Protein backbone atom coordinates (compact mmCIF):
# COMPACT_ATOMS: atom_id res chain seq x y z
CA UNK A 1 0.00 0.00 0.00
CA UNK A 2 2.54 2.59 1.17
CA UNK A 3 6.20 2.77 0.18
CA UNK A 4 9.45 4.45 1.23
CA UNK A 5 12.53 4.56 -1.02
CA UNK A 6 15.56 2.86 0.57
CA UNK A 7 18.20 5.72 1.06
CA UNK A 8 21.76 6.02 -0.27
CA UNK A 9 23.77 4.00 2.26
CA UNK A 10 21.27 2.39 4.64
CA UNK A 11 21.76 -1.34 4.06
CA UNK A 12 18.41 -3.21 3.78
CA UNK A 13 19.55 -5.88 6.24
CA UNK A 14 20.39 -3.26 8.84
CA UNK A 15 17.08 -1.45 8.47
CA UNK A 16 15.07 -4.68 8.39
CA UNK A 17 16.72 -6.00 11.56
CA UNK A 18 16.03 -2.73 13.38
CA UNK A 19 12.41 -2.32 12.22
CA UNK A 20 10.94 -4.64 14.86
CA UNK A 21 11.92 -2.34 17.72
CA UNK A 22 10.10 0.64 16.20
CA UNK A 23 6.98 -0.93 14.66
CA UNK A 24 6.47 -3.30 17.57
CA UNK A 25 3.41 -1.95 19.40
CA UNK A 26 4.86 -2.13 22.92
CA UNK A 27 7.09 -4.70 24.66
CA UNK A 28 9.24 -7.51 23.35
CA UNK A 29 6.43 -8.20 20.90
CA UNK A 30 7.16 -11.35 18.94
CA UNK A 31 8.20 -11.12 15.32
CA UNK A 32 9.96 -13.02 12.55
CA UNK A 33 12.17 -11.48 9.87
CA UNK A 34 12.60 -13.70 6.82
CA UNK A 35 14.99 -13.00 3.96
CA UNK A 36 14.61 -14.44 0.48
CA UNK A 37 17.74 -13.58 -1.51
CA UNK A 38 17.86 -9.85 -0.77
CA UNK A 39 14.13 -9.54 -0.14
CA UNK A 40 13.17 -9.17 3.54
CA UNK A 41 9.73 -9.60 5.06
CA UNK A 42 9.07 -8.62 8.65
CA UNK A 43 6.10 -10.28 10.30
CA UNK A 44 5.68 -8.17 13.43
CA UNK A 45 3.23 -8.93 16.21
CA UNK A 46 1.10 -12.01 16.71
CA UNK A 47 -2.53 -11.87 15.65
CA UNK A 48 -3.02 -15.61 16.00
CA UNK A 49 -0.47 -18.28 16.90
CA UNK A 50 -0.73 -21.99 16.13
CA UNK A 51 1.33 -24.22 18.41
CA UNK A 52 1.66 -27.85 17.43
CA UNK A 53 3.22 -30.05 20.09
CA UNK A 54 3.71 -33.82 20.13
CA UNK A 55 0.64 -34.17 22.35
CA UNK A 56 -1.49 -31.11 21.67
CA UNK A 57 -2.57 -28.42 19.21
CA UNK A 58 -3.22 -24.92 20.51
CA UNK A 59 -4.45 -21.75 18.85
CA UNK A 60 -3.64 -18.62 20.84
CA UNK A 61 -5.31 -15.30 20.13
CA UNK A 62 -4.90 -12.25 22.40
CA UNK A 63 -4.01 -14.28 25.48
CA UNK A 64 -6.91 -16.66 24.84
CA UNK A 65 -5.95 -20.26 24.19
CA UNK A 66 -7.89 -23.07 22.51
CA UNK A 67 -6.47 -26.49 23.40
CA UNK A 68 -7.31 -29.72 21.59
CA UNK A 69 -5.95 -33.15 20.76
CA UNK A 70 -4.87 -33.90 17.20
CA UNK A 71 -4.33 -37.21 15.42
CA UNK A 72 -2.96 -38.60 12.18
CA UNK A 73 0.10 -37.22 10.43
CA UNK A 74 1.60 -33.96 11.74
CA UNK A 75 1.61 -32.53 8.23
CA UNK A 76 -2.14 -33.03 8.01
CA UNK A 77 -2.79 -31.52 11.45
CA UNK A 78 -0.50 -28.56 10.81
CA UNK A 79 -1.87 -28.06 7.31
CA UNK A 80 -5.44 -27.88 8.54
CA UNK A 81 -4.53 -25.33 11.22
CA UNK A 82 -2.42 -23.14 8.94
CA UNK A 83 -5.00 -23.28 6.15
CA UNK A 84 -7.48 -21.77 8.62
CA UNK A 85 -4.93 -19.15 9.71
CA UNK A 86 -4.44 -18.10 6.09
CA UNK A 87 -8.16 -17.34 5.84
CA UNK A 88 -7.38 -14.22 7.88
CA UNK A 89 -3.96 -13.28 6.49
CA UNK A 90 -2.10 -13.36 3.18
CA UNK A 91 1.02 -14.84 4.80
CA UNK A 92 1.97 -16.90 7.87
CA UNK A 93 5.41 -17.42 9.37
CA UNK A 94 7.11 -19.68 11.84
CA UNK A 95 9.35 -22.66 12.31
CA UNK A 96 9.15 -26.42 12.12
CA UNK A 97 11.13 -28.61 14.47
CA UNK A 98 13.35 -31.52 13.52
CA UNK A 99 10.89 -33.61 15.56
CA UNK A 100 8.16 -32.82 13.02
CA UNK A 101 9.67 -35.51 10.78
CA UNK A 102 9.82 -38.45 13.19
CA UNK A 103 6.18 -39.58 12.98
CA UNK A 104 6.68 -40.90 9.44
CA UNK A 105 9.15 -43.42 10.90
CA UNK A 106 7.00 -44.49 13.84
CA UNK A 107 9.32 -42.82 16.34
CA UNK A 108 6.96 -40.19 17.76
CA UNK A 109 6.47 -42.34 20.86
CA UNK A 110 10.07 -41.44 21.73
CA UNK A 111 9.23 -37.74 22.01
CA UNK A 112 8.80 -36.43 25.54
CA UNK A 113 5.46 -34.77 26.28
CA UNK A 114 5.09 -31.15 25.16
CA UNK A 115 7.74 -31.53 22.47
CA UNK A 116 7.18 -28.67 20.03
CA UNK A 117 6.71 -29.68 16.40
CA UNK A 118 5.76 -26.37 14.82
CA UNK A 119 4.95 -22.75 15.61
CA UNK A 120 3.18 -20.74 12.93
CA UNK A 121 1.51 -17.36 13.24
CA UNK A 122 -0.47 -14.71 11.41
CA UNK A 123 1.27 -11.35 11.97
CA UNK A 124 -0.39 -8.11 13.07
CA UNK A 125 1.63 -6.26 10.43
CA UNK A 126 3.92 -7.08 7.52
CA UNK A 127 6.70 -4.91 6.15
CA UNK A 128 8.80 -5.75 3.11
CA UNK A 129 12.33 -4.44 2.71
CA UNK A 130 14.61 -4.50 -0.32
CA UNK A 131 17.58 -2.53 -1.63
CA UNK A 132 14.94 -0.56 -3.53
CA UNK A 133 12.31 0.25 -0.90
CA UNK A 134 10.30 -0.34 2.26
CA UNK A 135 6.67 -1.38 1.72
CA UNK A 136 3.93 -1.10 4.35
CA UNK A 137 0.56 -2.88 4.17
CA UNK A 138 -2.97 -1.97 5.27
CA UNK A 139 -3.15 -0.76 8.88
CA UNK A 140 0.61 -1.18 9.13
CA UNK A 141 0.75 2.03 7.10
CA UNK A 142 0.46 3.87 10.42
CA UNK A 143 4.04 2.85 11.24
CA UNK A 144 5.12 5.28 8.54
CA UNK A 145 6.01 7.97 11.08
CA UNK A 146 8.06 5.59 13.25
CA UNK A 147 9.95 4.22 10.24
CA UNK A 148 10.64 7.70 8.88
CA UNK A 149 11.82 8.61 12.38
CA UNK A 150 14.29 5.71 12.39
CA UNK A 151 15.68 6.64 8.98
CA UNK A 152 16.03 10.23 10.17
CA UNK A 153 18.10 9.37 13.25
CA UNK A 154 19.76 6.37 11.66
CA UNK A 155 19.96 2.76 12.86
CA UNK A 156 22.02 1.76 15.91
CA UNK A 157 25.64 1.17 14.98
CA UNK A 158 27.19 -2.28 15.37
CA UNK A 159 29.87 -2.54 18.08
CA UNK A 160 32.74 -5.00 18.13
CA UNK A 161 31.85 -8.66 18.63
CA UNK A 162 32.96 -10.81 21.58
CA UNK A 163 34.84 -14.07 20.96
CA UNK A 164 33.74 -17.51 22.14
CA UNK A 165 35.66 -20.76 22.53
CA UNK A 166 34.41 -23.72 20.50
CA UNK A 167 37.24 -26.12 21.40
CA UNK A 168 35.66 -27.68 24.51
CA UNK A 169 33.67 -30.91 24.04
CA UNK A 170 31.38 -31.25 27.12
CA UNK A 171 28.85 -33.40 25.22
CA UNK A 172 31.50 -35.89 24.11
CA UNK A 173 30.97 -35.32 20.40
CA UNK A 174 34.14 -37.24 19.58
CA UNK A 175 32.99 -40.27 21.59
CA UNK A 176 29.50 -40.19 20.07
CA UNK A 177 31.02 -40.13 16.58
CA UNK A 178 33.12 -43.18 17.49
CA UNK A 179 29.92 -44.97 18.52
CA UNK A 180 28.24 -44.09 15.22
CA UNK A 181 31.21 -45.26 13.14
CA UNK A 182 31.00 -48.59 14.96
CA UNK A 183 27.29 -48.94 14.20
CA UNK A 184 27.92 -48.06 10.55
CA UNK A 185 30.75 -50.60 10.41
CA UNK A 186 28.20 -53.09 11.75
CA UNK A 187 25.88 -52.18 8.88
CA UNK A 188 23.05 -50.62 10.87
CA UNK A 189 23.05 -47.62 8.51
CA UNK A 190 25.15 -45.75 5.95
CA UNK A 191 25.37 -42.26 7.42
CA UNK A 192 24.12 -40.17 10.33
CA UNK A 193 24.48 -36.49 11.10
CA UNK A 194 25.55 -35.92 14.71
CA UNK A 195 26.01 -32.51 16.33
CA UNK A 196 27.18 -30.63 19.41
CA UNK A 197 26.09 -27.44 21.13
CA UNK A 198 28.44 -24.62 22.06
CA UNK A 199 27.25 -22.41 24.90
CA UNK A 200 27.72 -18.66 24.54
CA UNK A 201 28.71 -17.40 28.05
CA UNK A 202 27.04 -14.01 27.62
CA UNK A 203 23.74 -12.60 26.38
CA UNK A 204 23.91 -11.41 22.79
CA UNK A 205 21.95 -8.72 20.96
CA UNK A 206 20.19 -10.74 18.26
CA UNK A 207 19.38 -7.88 15.88
CA UNK A 208 22.97 -6.59 16.10
CA UNK A 209 24.47 -10.05 15.76
CA UNK A 210 22.19 -10.79 12.81
CA UNK A 211 23.31 -7.58 11.10
CA UNK A 212 27.01 -8.21 11.68
CA UNK A 213 26.73 -11.79 10.48
CA UNK A 214 24.75 -10.74 7.42
CA UNK A 215 27.68 -8.58 6.30
CA UNK A 216 29.86 -11.68 6.12
CA UNK A 217 27.28 -14.28 5.08
CA UNK A 218 25.11 -13.92 1.96
CA UNK A 219 22.78 -16.98 2.02
CA UNK A 220 19.74 -17.37 -0.21
CA UNK A 221 17.68 -17.41 2.98
CA UNK A 222 18.22 -15.93 6.44
CA UNK A 223 16.16 -15.13 9.51
CA UNK A 224 15.91 -13.33 12.83
CA UNK A 225 13.09 -14.00 15.24
CA UNK A 226 11.63 -13.60 18.70
CA UNK A 227 8.77 -16.03 19.13
CA UNK A 228 7.28 -17.57 22.26
CA UNK A 229 10.33 -17.18 24.47
CA UNK A 230 12.78 -18.12 21.74
CA UNK A 231 15.26 -15.75 20.09
CA UNK A 232 17.04 -17.09 17.03
CA UNK A 233 18.94 -15.97 13.96
CA UNK A 234 20.47 -17.89 11.11
CA UNK A 235 21.92 -18.01 7.62
CA UNK A 236 20.48 -20.84 5.53
CA UNK A 237 21.85 -21.67 2.08
CA UNK A 238 19.72 -24.83 1.84
CA UNK A 239 16.06 -24.89 0.83
CA UNK A 240 14.51 -28.07 2.21
CA UNK A 241 11.18 -27.42 0.49
CA UNK A 242 9.63 -24.73 -1.69
CA UNK A 243 6.11 -25.02 -3.09
CA UNK A 244 4.85 -22.46 -5.61
CA UNK A 245 1.22 -21.42 -6.08
CA UNK A 246 1.24 -23.16 -9.47
CA UNK A 247 2.12 -26.47 -7.85
CA UNK A 248 5.83 -26.68 -8.65
CA UNK A 249 7.79 -28.18 -5.74
CA UNK A 250 11.54 -27.85 -5.28
CA UNK A 251 14.15 -29.10 -2.83
CA UNK A 252 17.87 -28.31 -2.98
CA UNK A 253 20.15 -30.73 -1.13
CA UNK A 254 23.55 -29.16 -0.52
CA UNK A 255 26.58 -31.39 -1.13
CA UNK A 256 29.36 -29.37 0.46
CA UNK A 257 30.85 -25.94 1.06
CA UNK A 258 34.28 -24.30 0.71
CA UNK A 259 35.62 -20.84 1.43
CA UNK A 260 35.57 -18.27 -1.38
CA UNK A 261 37.20 -14.89 -1.98
CA UNK A 262 40.69 -15.78 -0.77
CA UNK A 263 42.39 -15.14 -4.09
CA UNK A 264 42.53 -17.08 -7.41
CA UNK A 265 44.94 -19.93 -6.61
CA UNK A 266 43.38 -20.68 -3.23
CA UNK A 267 39.79 -20.36 -4.47
CA UNK A 268 40.27 -22.57 -7.53
CA UNK A 269 42.02 -25.17 -5.37
CA UNK A 270 39.01 -25.12 -3.06
CA UNK A 271 36.60 -25.38 -5.98
CA UNK A 272 38.47 -28.25 -7.63
CA UNK A 273 38.26 -30.18 -4.36
CA UNK A 274 34.59 -29.30 -3.97
CA UNK A 275 33.80 -30.62 -7.45
CA UNK A 276 36.04 -33.70 -7.26
CA UNK A 277 35.82 -34.79 -3.62
CA UNK A 278 34.76 -38.44 -3.95
CA UNK A 279 33.31 -38.48 -0.43
CA UNK A 280 31.07 -35.46 -0.95
CA UNK A 281 30.16 -36.54 -4.50
CA UNK A 282 29.01 -40.01 -3.39
CA UNK A 283 27.03 -38.72 -0.43
CA UNK A 284 25.44 -36.05 -2.59
CA UNK A 285 24.47 -38.62 -5.22
CA UNK A 286 22.87 -40.72 -2.49
CA UNK A 287 21.11 -37.63 -1.08
CA UNK A 288 19.85 -36.62 -4.52
CA UNK A 289 18.54 -40.14 -5.12
CA UNK A 290 16.85 -40.00 -1.72
CA UNK A 291 15.21 -36.64 -2.44
CA UNK A 292 13.97 -37.86 -5.83
CA UNK A 293 12.35 -40.90 -4.25
CA UNK A 294 10.76 -38.82 -1.50
CA UNK A 295 9.42 -36.14 -3.84
CA UNK A 296 8.10 -38.83 -6.18
CA UNK A 297 5.66 -40.02 -3.50
CA UNK A 298 3.79 -36.69 -3.62
CA UNK A 299 4.32 -35.62 -7.23
CA UNK A 300 2.37 -36.04 -10.45
CA UNK A 301 3.74 -39.19 -12.13
CA UNK A 302 6.76 -38.44 -14.31
CA UNK A 303 7.14 -34.80 -13.24
CA UNK A 304 10.10 -35.30 -10.90
CA UNK A 305 13.53 -34.38 -12.25
CA UNK A 306 16.97 -33.12 -11.24
CA UNK A 307 17.79 -29.66 -12.55
CA UNK A 308 21.29 -28.17 -12.22
CA UNK A 309 22.94 -31.38 -11.04
CA UNK A 310 26.11 -30.76 -9.02
CA UNK A 311 26.32 -27.06 -9.80
CA UNK A 312 28.44 -24.62 -7.81
CA UNK A 313 26.80 -21.52 -6.35
CA UNK A 314 29.12 -18.74 -5.24
CA UNK A 315 27.79 -16.74 -2.32
CA UNK A 316 30.37 -14.15 -1.34
CA UNK A 317 32.55 -15.66 1.38
CA UNK A 318 31.62 -19.21 0.43
CA UNK A 319 30.79 -21.46 -2.50
CA UNK A 320 28.32 -24.35 -2.33
CA UNK A 321 27.98 -27.52 -4.38
CA UNK A 322 24.43 -28.80 -4.79
CA UNK A 323 21.50 -29.86 -6.97
CA UNK A 324 17.88 -28.82 -7.47
CA UNK A 325 15.15 -31.44 -7.55
CA UNK A 326 11.84 -30.34 -9.07
CA UNK A 327 8.39 -31.87 -9.51
CA UNK A 328 4.71 -30.97 -9.71
CA UNK A 329 2.65 -31.58 -6.59
CA UNK A 330 0.06 -34.31 -7.14
CA UNK A 331 -3.48 -32.85 -7.11
CA UNK A 332 -4.19 -35.23 -4.21
CA UNK A 333 -1.30 -33.87 -2.14
CA UNK A 334 -0.60 -30.54 -0.43
CA UNK A 335 2.31 -28.28 0.58
CA UNK A 336 2.36 -29.79 4.07
CA UNK A 337 2.51 -33.31 2.66
CA UNK A 338 5.42 -32.10 0.55
CA UNK A 339 7.20 -30.68 3.59
CA UNK A 340 6.81 -33.85 5.62
CA UNK A 341 7.77 -35.97 2.60
CA UNK A 342 11.16 -34.22 2.51
CA UNK A 343 11.47 -33.99 6.31
CA UNK A 344 13.79 -34.19 8.04
CA UNK A 345 16.30 -33.00 5.43
CA UNK A 346 18.33 -35.98 4.27
CA UNK A 347 21.43 -33.76 4.51
CA UNK A 348 20.84 -33.20 8.23
CA UNK A 349 19.59 -36.63 9.32
CA UNK A 350 21.06 -39.72 7.69
CA UNK A 351 20.83 -42.62 5.25
CA UNK A 352 18.62 -44.61 5.36
CA UNK A 353 16.61 -41.73 6.81
CA UNK A 354 14.55 -43.94 9.13
CA UNK A 355 17.72 -45.46 10.62
CA UNK A 356 19.47 -42.09 10.73
CA UNK A 357 16.67 -40.38 12.65
CA UNK A 358 16.53 -43.29 15.12
CA UNK A 359 20.29 -43.03 15.73
CA UNK A 360 19.96 -39.30 16.36
CA UNK A 361 17.54 -40.10 19.17
CA UNK A 362 20.29 -42.20 20.75
CA UNK A 363 23.50 -40.39 19.85
CA UNK A 364 22.54 -36.70 19.75
CA UNK A 365 21.13 -34.22 22.26
CA UNK A 366 17.36 -34.27 21.74
CA UNK A 367 15.00 -32.60 21.07
CA UNK A 368 16.88 -30.76 18.32
CA UNK A 369 14.05 -28.26 17.98
CA UNK A 370 14.87 -25.50 15.49
CA UNK A 371 18.28 -27.03 14.74
CA UNK A 372 18.06 -29.11 11.53
CA UNK A 373 14.43 -28.02 11.44
CA UNK A 374 13.19 -25.18 9.23
CA UNK A 375 12.01 -21.59 9.31
CA UNK A 376 8.96 -21.21 7.09
CA UNK A 377 6.84 -18.72 5.18
CA UNK A 378 3.39 -19.75 3.94
CA UNK A 379 1.14 -17.83 1.56
CA UNK A 380 -2.64 -17.82 1.14
CA UNK A 381 -2.21 -18.78 -2.52
CA UNK A 382 -0.72 -22.14 -1.54
CA UNK A 383 2.92 -21.10 -1.35
CA UNK A 384 5.44 -22.55 1.08
CA UNK A 385 9.10 -21.70 1.59
CA UNK A 386 11.12 -23.71 4.12
CA UNK A 387 14.77 -22.91 4.81
CA UNK A 388 16.85 -25.56 6.60
CA UNK A 389 18.22 -24.24 9.89
CA UNK A 390 21.80 -25.24 10.64
CA UNK A 391 24.09 -22.22 11.01
CA UNK A 392 22.10 -20.41 13.71
CA UNK A 393 22.19 -19.05 17.26
CA UNK A 394 19.46 -19.49 19.86
CA UNK A 395 18.46 -17.97 23.20
CA UNK A 396 15.93 -19.79 25.36
CA UNK A 397 15.20 -19.71 29.07
CA UNK A 398 18.24 -17.54 29.70
CA UNK A 399 20.65 -19.82 27.83
CA UNK A 400 22.35 -18.89 24.57
CA UNK A 401 24.01 -21.34 22.20
CA UNK A 402 25.12 -22.44 18.75
CA UNK A 403 24.91 -25.93 17.28
CA UNK A 404 26.82 -27.59 14.47
CA UNK A 405 27.12 -31.11 13.13
CA UNK A 406 28.93 -33.30 10.65
CA UNK A 407 27.90 -36.21 8.45
CA UNK A 408 29.31 -39.43 9.86
CA UNK A 409 30.18 -42.33 7.57
CA UNK A 410 32.23 -45.53 7.91
CA UNK A 411 35.57 -43.80 7.24
CA UNK A 412 34.92 -40.82 9.53
CA UNK A 413 37.52 -39.87 12.14
CA UNK A 414 36.10 -38.30 15.33
CA UNK A 415 38.89 -35.72 15.47
CA UNK A 416 38.46 -34.69 11.83
CA UNK A 417 34.69 -34.45 12.31
CA UNK A 418 35.09 -32.41 15.48
CA UNK A 419 37.24 -30.04 13.42
CA UNK A 420 34.52 -29.86 10.77
CA UNK A 421 32.08 -28.62 13.43
CA UNK A 422 34.58 -25.92 14.40
CA UNK A 423 34.80 -24.82 10.76
CA UNK A 424 31.02 -24.53 10.50
CA UNK A 425 30.67 -22.65 13.78
CA UNK A 426 33.28 -20.17 12.51
CA UNK A 427 30.68 -18.68 10.16
CA UNK A 428 28.94 -17.25 13.24
CA UNK A 429 31.30 -17.24 16.22
CA UNK A 430 33.26 -14.18 15.10
CA UNK A 431 30.13 -12.04 14.80
CA UNK A 432 28.50 -12.37 18.21
CA UNK A 433 27.54 -8.97 19.62
CA UNK A 434 27.08 -8.95 23.40
CA UNK A 435 24.17 -7.74 25.55
238 is known as an active-site residue? yes
Q: Within its chain, how far is the Cα of 195 from the centroid?
A: 16
**Residues 6+ positions from 292 with CB-CB distance below 8 Å:** 304, 306, 325
Strand, coil or helix: 365: coil
| Residues of the binding site | 256-257, 283, 371, 391, 405-407, 417, 420, 424
φ/ψ of residue 200, rounded to 5:
-95, 115
8-state DSSP, 431: G
397: left (phi over 0), alpha (psi -120 to 50) or beta: left
Entry resolution (Å): 1.8
Burial class (CB in 10 A: 0-12, 13-18, 19+), 8: exposed
SS3 sequence, 293-341? HHHHCCECCCCCEEEEEEEEEEECCEEEEEEEEEEEECCCCCHHHHHHH
CB 178 within 8 A of CB 162: no
**Residues 6+ positions from 207 with CB-CB distance below 8 Å:** 17, 18, 20, 21, 224
φ/ψ of residue 115, rounded to 5:
-75, 120
CB 295 within 8 A of CB 312: no
Report how far residue 98's alpha carbon sits from residue 80's, in angstroms, rounded to the nearest whole number.
20
Report how far residue 88's alpha carbon sits from residue 120's, in angstroms, rounded to the nearest whole number.
13
8-state DSSP, 434: B
Q: What CATH number does domain 1-435 carry, 3.60.120.10, 3.40.47.10, 3.40.30.10, 3.40.50.300?
A: 3.60.120.10
φ/ψ of residue 398, rounded to 5:
90, -5
φ/ψ of residue 380, rounded to 5:
-60, -25
CB 160 within 8 A of CB 365: no
Strand partners for 326: 250, 305
Among the options 18, 35, 51, 238, which is catalytic?
238
Report how far residue 176's alpha carbon sits from residue 362's, in angstroms, rounded to the nearest whole number.
9
| Residues of the binding site for Mg(2+) | 283, 417, 420
Q: How far is CA 170 from CA 198, 347, 362, 369, 404, in A?
A: 9, 25, 17, 20, 14
Write down the domain spans for the chain: 1-435
The total of other beta-carbon atoms located within 10 Å of residue 279's CB is: 12
SS3 sequence, 209-227? HHHHHHCCCCCCEEEEEEE
8-state DSSP, 244: -
Burial class (CB in 10 A: 0-12, 13-18, 19+), 399: exposed
Report how far residue 354's alpha carbon sits from residue 344's, in angstroms, rounded to the nearest whole number.
10
CB 132 within 8 A of CB 5: yes
Report how far residue 89's alpha carbon sits from residue 92's, in angstroms, rounded to the nearest whole number.
7
Amino acid sequence: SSSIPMPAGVNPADLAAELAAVVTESVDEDYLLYECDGQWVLAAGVQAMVELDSDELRVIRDGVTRRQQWSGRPGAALGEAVDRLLLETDQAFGWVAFEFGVHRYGLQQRLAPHTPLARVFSPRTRIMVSEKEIRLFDAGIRHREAIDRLLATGVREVPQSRSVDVSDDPSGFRRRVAVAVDEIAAGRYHKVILSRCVEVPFAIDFPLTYRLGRRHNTPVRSFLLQLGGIRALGYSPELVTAVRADGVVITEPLAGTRALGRGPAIDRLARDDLESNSKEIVEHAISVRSSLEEITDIAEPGSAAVIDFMTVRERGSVQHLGSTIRARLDPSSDRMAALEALFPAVTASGIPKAAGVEAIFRLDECPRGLYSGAVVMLSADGGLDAALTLRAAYQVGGRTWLRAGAGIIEESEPEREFEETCEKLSTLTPYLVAR
